[PDB]
Amino acid sequence: MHGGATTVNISTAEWWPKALNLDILSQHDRKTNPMGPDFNYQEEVKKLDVAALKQDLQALMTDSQDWWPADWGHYGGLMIRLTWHAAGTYRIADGRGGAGTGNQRFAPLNSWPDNTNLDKARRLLWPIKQKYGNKLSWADLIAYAGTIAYESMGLKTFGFAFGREDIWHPEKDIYWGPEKEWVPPSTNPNSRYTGDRELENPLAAVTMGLIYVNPEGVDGNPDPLKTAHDVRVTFARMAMNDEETVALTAGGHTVGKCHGNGNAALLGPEPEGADVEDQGLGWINKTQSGIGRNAVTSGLEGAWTPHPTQWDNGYFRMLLNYDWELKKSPAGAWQWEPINPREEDLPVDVEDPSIRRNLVMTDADMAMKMDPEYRKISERFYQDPAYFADVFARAWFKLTHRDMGPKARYIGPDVPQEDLIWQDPIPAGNRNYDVQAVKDRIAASGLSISELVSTAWDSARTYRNSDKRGGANGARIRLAPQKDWEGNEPDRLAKVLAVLEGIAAATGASVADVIVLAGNVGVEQAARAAGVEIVLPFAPGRGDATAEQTDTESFAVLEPIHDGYRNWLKQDYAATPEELLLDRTQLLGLTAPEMTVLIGGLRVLGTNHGGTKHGVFTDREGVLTNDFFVNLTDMNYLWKPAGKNLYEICDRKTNQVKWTATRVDLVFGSNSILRAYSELYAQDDNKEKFVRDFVAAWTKVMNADRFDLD
Amino acid sequence: MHGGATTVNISTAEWWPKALNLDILSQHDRKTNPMGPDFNYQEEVKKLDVAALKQDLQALMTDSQDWWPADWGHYGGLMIRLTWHAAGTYRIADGRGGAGTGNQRFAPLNSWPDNTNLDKARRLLWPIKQKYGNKLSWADLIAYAGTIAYESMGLKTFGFAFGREDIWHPEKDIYWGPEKEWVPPSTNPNSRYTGDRELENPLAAVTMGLIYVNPEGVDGNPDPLKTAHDVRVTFARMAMNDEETVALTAGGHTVGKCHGNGNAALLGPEPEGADVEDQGLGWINKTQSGIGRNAVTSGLEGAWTPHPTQWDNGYFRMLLNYDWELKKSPAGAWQWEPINPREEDLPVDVEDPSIRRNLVMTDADMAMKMDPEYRKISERFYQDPAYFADVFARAWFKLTHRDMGPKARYIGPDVPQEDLIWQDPIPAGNRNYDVQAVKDRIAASGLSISELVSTAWDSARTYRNSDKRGGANGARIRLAPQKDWEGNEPDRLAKVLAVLEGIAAATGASVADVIVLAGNVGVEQAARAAGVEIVLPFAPGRGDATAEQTDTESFAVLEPIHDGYRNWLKQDYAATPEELLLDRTQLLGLTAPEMTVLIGGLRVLGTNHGGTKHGVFTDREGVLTNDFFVNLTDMNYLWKPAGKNLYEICDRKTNQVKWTATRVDLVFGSNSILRAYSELYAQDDNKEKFVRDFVAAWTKVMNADRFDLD
Numbered sequence A, B: 001m002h003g004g005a006t007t008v009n010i011s012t013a014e015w016w017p018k019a020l021n022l023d024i025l026s027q028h029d030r031k032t033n034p035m036g037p038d039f040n041y042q043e044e045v046k047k048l049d050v051a052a053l054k055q056d057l058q059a060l061m062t063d064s065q066d067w068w069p070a071d072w073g074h075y076g077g078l079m080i081r082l083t084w085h086a087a088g089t090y091r092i093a094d095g096r097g098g099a100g101t102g103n104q105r106f107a108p109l110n111s112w113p114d115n116t117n118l119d120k121a122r123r124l125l126w127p128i129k130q131k132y133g134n135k136l137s138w139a140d141l142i143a144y145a146g147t148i149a150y151e152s153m154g155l156k157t158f159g160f161a162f163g164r165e166d167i168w169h170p171e172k173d174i175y176w177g178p179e180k181e182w183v184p185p186s187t188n189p190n191s192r193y194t195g196d197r198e199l200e201n202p203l204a205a206v207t208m209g210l211i212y213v214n215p216e217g218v219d220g221n222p223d224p225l226k227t228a229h230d231v232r233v234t235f236a237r238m239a240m241n242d243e244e245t246v247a248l249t250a251g252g253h254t255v256g257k258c259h260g261n262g263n264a265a266l267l268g269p270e271p272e273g274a275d276v277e278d279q280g281l282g283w284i285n286k287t288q289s290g291i292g293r294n295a296v297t298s299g300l301e302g303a304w305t306p307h308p309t310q311w312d313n314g315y316f317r318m319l320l321n322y323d324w325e326l327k328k329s330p331a332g333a334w335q336w337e338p339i340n341p342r343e344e345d346l347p348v349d350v351e352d353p354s355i356r357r358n359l360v361m362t363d364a365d366m367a368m369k370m371d372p373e374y375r376k377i378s379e380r381f382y383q384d385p386a387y388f389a390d391v392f393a394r395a396w397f398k399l400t401h402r403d404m405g406p407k408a409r410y411i412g413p414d415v416p417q418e419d420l421i422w423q424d425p426i427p428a429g430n431r432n433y434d435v436q437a438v439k440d441r442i443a444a445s446g447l448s449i450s451e452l453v454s455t456a457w458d459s460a461r462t463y464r465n466s467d468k469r470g471g472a473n474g475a476r477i478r479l480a481p482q483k484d485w486e487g488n489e490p491d492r493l494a495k496v497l498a499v500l501e502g503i504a505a506a507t508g509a510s511v512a513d514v515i516v517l518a519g520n521v522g523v524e525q526a527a528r529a530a531g532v533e534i535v536l537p538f539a540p541g542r543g544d545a546t547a548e549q550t551d552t553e554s555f556a557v558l559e560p561i562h563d564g565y566r567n568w569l570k571q572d573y574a575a576t577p578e579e580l581l582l583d584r585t586q587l588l589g590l591t592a593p594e595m596t597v598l599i600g601g602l603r604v605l606g607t608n609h610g611g612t613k614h615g616v617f618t619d620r621e622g623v624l625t626n627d628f629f630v631n632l633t634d635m636n637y638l639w640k641p642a643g644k645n646l647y648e649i650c651d652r653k654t655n656q657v658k659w660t661a662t663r664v665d666l667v668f669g670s671n672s673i674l675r676a677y678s679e680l681y682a683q684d685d686n687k688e689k690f691v692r693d694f695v696a697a698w699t700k701v702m703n704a705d706r707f708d709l710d
């Protein structure tokens, strides 16, 4: 018996299950990154021999390997499912999930029941990854595989961008839902459904371990109309509308098949549950043949089209021109099969083309026929295949690139020149202007420190690294819907914008550059007022985006309904305010020390929403000192709960109320890690370290979206 | 509802509770460290004004604070308990626990029931920490507080060393035991006791959340003789023998008291369980007065001596010259109280000295009277107090410094010049010698690569960063007990030592420097044989320790009974081999990427214990290439379990056995994180990166104990 906490069950986590999960802020660090510290994937991938890659990947599609042979000699359907599943984890509420990090090769996603046998697909890509090496991330490779499969099977894809950097462990920040079992029906303890089958809000799948919906029907009970409702809901939470959804569904099932020819109970554990002999793979059948015609994956069995190795118009020919009834696959799954199909329409056996097998549709396919709105789009696609192929190709491109962020991050020869609106386009901003002049006019305006700092904070605080949307580039805070969001304090904002817009006209700097410069000036002034002189570093070049290139509705999701950094809460949510602060801070890409210095700094700058004094533990607001920490850590005070999210900080001797504070303020003096950082910053010797760390964190946030640089 | 995994309950941990806990290798990294990257505590603490510190800390002892007032105006007893508990977590089997990192200010230890109200003690030290700042770690401050309390109450302490660096989160690598509740009796599911009340082996306390033993008796049932047995056992696992144990116990209880005057059920949650109003503190009584005479801590109530604010000979006067019986404290705890004590021996009330209260002894104190072996030592101490005070002072110093490592790490003016044997002393080795000459004679000997590398690996692999014992400095591998350990292959070792000892005599380099240089030469040769030229970096100066300064028995604990790095297992243990590898790697201070490249490199060097070919996936053993990874990741093979800790790696086409392998080898191709690293190192473009990373990891291990440098 050794003393190491050597398995994941052994931790502090079990004793206090409600503690802040601060580890989510210290992921993807030096000790897990096996690359050198100056390795830069973007420069390496710019040197990738893409034409040779394209060729190898095309050849892989008809290069069957004996340990997991290709259906009909063609891996295309499998590779498309790979890429679709990689990308189908994305959700709009927080931007988390998607294909942008290569996450499918790690827990939990490598072992979701919906990703069954995608472990075979990934592994089949290894010889390619091995060949191209550090110039081809696993993330880009996984995202690309299905696009090349489409090209090889006859579809004109819209394009492709490289630029996704690999990670080296699971994304600990992603909450995938409340369940403690895989794929439970919504009539379960810990259900993700509330009220009238309303899906809990960040979530974009109908249950734990599925991509979107249950292909056998809602909670496993076929009904195309109820299935349609889930499809509409989930796909909407993955940024897709009805037309995109029907296109994706039909275009997906234009190729490939369902695998369910055997007994599912004979499959070995999923990959994270399997033992070492399985080579990182899972769902292996050691009892009988689990490969080729005997593959079991979803448990449904059949292909949607007569020719599943090729792009064609088989999908709607089959769906719409045959009548369908419910049947059970050999593995016991519900599926739809057509009534009296013709021989010549039967897909052949995957190993022997002289045997005919069956056609199928899932409950989600039948939803495309029975939902009245989908039926119309389906008819359009049956009538107008050129439109079908163009809508699908664009949707497939959107699917696989929706978390890539600004076009500045896109690399390679098949990047579309078009600026799609879901890329939140922003032009390059002028960089030849005198920065000092802009600064002097900001200083010469009569806008306070408070006005300047809050406005810059609010412009940048929308950034989220999950899908790389938001941030200060573009000055979308001056457009709808941002300029009217309650948390942005639209009056104060309009007042500042009037001034700063005039300064930008006068100077030839973008409004975006000026908003940020202005925040810098407020910080510089507050430091100066503590007798400290610095110039904050500054990168010009931000563009101002137009309303035309700003999809008002897609921005709903970036609204700051909470921001602990300005002691802001729009309503009294379920989550604790400090959990909300942790979430926002993780999206911003900030560490726990960074979060800490920002909070202390913003507080003494006087930047709370509504001009509240909660957490403003200073006699000199507007002056940049470590007062917040000095006072938070002083045991001459006691802390008295005083209603919702509010405390009285009281002098122990006089029993008088000296300040007030929220839970967001006080967690920095309560949580044992955070108080340790608070104490560091409250040391007599750490005043300048505080200012310096504050400034660095401020700058990091201001620059977070600046992929146009770097 | 936000999408962030914002509480510690939400993780991958619950789905696969048996996965390797690789996070323990990536702790204490840049994103949690709030200090600058060139901050070096050792240089800062060398500038600390220690005399002024001593004075402030002495003054703190009689500087009562109203929110937790000092007993009789003196915090000494509290401060000694602090420091004792900080240090009493240490255990010898793995070196983990102790006062060396300041761990008491973080979960779980900040919230153990045994650390009740030590949150008050730590907090009382804050004004000091605030004053001295980055030059005084919390770890050093906590370790020092009790030593200064002793000085102030009249004991001549033996000394003190600064040099413990702060950490910023819990020590995730420490397995504290199997229980899921605090302080369950050993008749529980998940018990730490096996067989005839045998304590499971790394563990050094009788239950979860205690320091050593239950002060009310075994599982709460008073019996001094059974208590004695636990005391002997636990203290032995904390490196203390009978004399040290009686001394510590009596010297501890010469001052201070037990607090149990109230109702324990009225205490608020422990700190990690408390809400934000409690300022990071815990066990707060909001129902009645929980301070001063009304303090409740252990639930026992009374002082061991008449004058608990002073060092004196009260302990054995009381214990031995009164007869004792069992009674219940006001909080309901069992305690021993004397029969017919005199008034003048009654400790006074902690607030009002004109009221007399009671004397007490715990079941562990009565063990010092009733255990026949302890009784004799107790009589010696009653008879010879000068000897008592000297043994206690030394033991207290040992207690608080046992995890500090070599004397090279000790800093400050009260460091004892004596070399204590538990410091594993090693002299400075000569550094003026021609390195190249030594190398040429190593090369000119006929020792193989295999011999050279294994011998250097085995010399260094004993290091553990938990208590900083072991490592290649000192060449203790050539002494008892090391030279005869089975895992060290004593014949092969003796053969190499003969040669290298001759080289060291000839050259004036220590045997220790030569063992390491020799390993370097084997690596250099293996690289050369792949047509790669490097000189490995090399730091001379290792000393050769003597047998006189080597406590044979204390080294039992560093024996390599398992080492995955040489595919070594001494017997077929409960833990999986790969969990054992993870444990060893954590003690070595290595990251997961480092662990990975080492394994692949050692395998192809031909360094397995017993000359086994398990994991030796090369046709060119002795040549330093990435073959291990290339072959591990090649799906032309399948992997067949073949008995205990063994697999056949078989060609899929011929169905023939190409190599064999252990679980230690194969986890690098099975675990999803490890295989990701294996794939990186198997890329066509990463051969040199592999050699380079291997070399850096090798060097890190060779230099791990070199605190005499740096």
Ligand code: HEB
Binding pocket: A071, A076, A077, A078, A080, A081, A084, A212, A213, A214, A215, A231, A248, A249, A251, A252, A253, A255, A256, A257, A258, A259, A260, A296, A297, A298, A299, A300, A362, A364
């Ligand atoms: C775009 C793309 C896509 C999309 C979106 C989709 C959408 C979908 N999907 Fe899909 N899928 C697909 C594409 C797809 N898909 C493919 C390609 C496949 C095939 C695979 C193979 O062949 O292998 C599938 C397959 C499949 C399957 C089978 C699997 C196996 O193998 O068994 C299923 C169940 C499904 C379902 C589904 C659903 C429910 C949905 C909803 C809506 N799919």
Ligand code: HEB
Binding pocket: B071, B076, B077, B078, B080, B081, B084, B212, B213, B214, B215, B231, B248, B249, B251, B252, B253, B255, B256, B257, B258, B259, B260, B296, B297, B298, B299, B300, B362, B364
């Ligand atoms: C060295 C040192 C030391 C040592 C080793 C010890 C050892 C011991 N111990 Fe101790 N303790 C102590 C020192 C000590 N100690 C002190 C100082 C005190 C007091 C605190 C005050 O005064 O506050 C105590 C206290 C105590 C108490 C009470 C707490 C309260 O407050 O309530 C108890 C129960 C105990 C037990 C014990 C035991 C069972 C043991 C075993 C053996 N302790």
Ligand code: NA
Binding pocket: A090, A095, A096, A097, A098, A100, A403, A466, A467
């Ligand atoms: Na994302």
Ligand code: NA
Binding pocket: A254, A255, A305, A306, A307, A308, A309, A310, A311, A312, A314
């Ligand atoms: Na087709």
Ligand code: NA
Binding pocket: B090, B095, B096, B097, B098, B100, B403, B466, B467
């Ligand atoms: Na330790």
Ligand code: NA
Binding pocket: B254, B255, B305, B306, B307, B308, B309, B310, B311, B312, B314
């Ligand atoms: Na005393």
